[PDB]
Amino acid sequence: MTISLNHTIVPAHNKEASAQFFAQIFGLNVSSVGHFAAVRVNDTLTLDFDDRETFESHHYAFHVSDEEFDTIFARIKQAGLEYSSDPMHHNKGEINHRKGGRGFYFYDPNGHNLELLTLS
Amino acid sequence: MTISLNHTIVPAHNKEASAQFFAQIFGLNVSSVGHFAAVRVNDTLTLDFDDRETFESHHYAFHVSDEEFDTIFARIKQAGLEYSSDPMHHNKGEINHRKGGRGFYFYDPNGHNLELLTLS
Ligand SMILES: [Ca+2]
């Protein structure tokens, strides 16, 4: 039938801090699974945070509902985090309106580029 | 629920060779999209292959049907690629039978660790 992404490993300097950051902002939960701090995103995907000393910035873009967009964006502002309309973060403190939707980018504690969008 | 991963950037020394490798083995298509060689995996997810000189190994685990598993595994053997039952590739030329399913690991041309699983 269908190929689906089930797991991906997210490298982190501190896997618990990174998993907690992600779970707090997205309204999800952290589980200790083997050597990972695992965050189940939905009924098909889990992000496995893994302790790593050296790695480059990843880029993850998430489709969310309008309600989820508003809820997550409020948590980012409440947490005192910077965000941008553009992937390079040249345009801070604003969102994009690409494809008749809403979008923005924000870095995780490792410098991974997280992207939220309402229309895919 | 309504958070889904829509895009992720896969770093590659050669984005066209890497996107073609992934598309050939998984039975997918490559599109040129901006500076990416993009592979739509399913209705939800696109892998964006991006030219990069320096990066660390990523890990992506895909859930597939038994039929898809067999079709992909046969392409991997026909292509002359090594695979393993374990994530560290200590046990080559065998698959695992974990979680009431079948699984195996194989590297892409960049050394990204690709995992296939049927689960249940
Ligand atoms: Ca998903």
Ligand SMILES: [Mg+2]
């Ligand atoms: Mg998927």
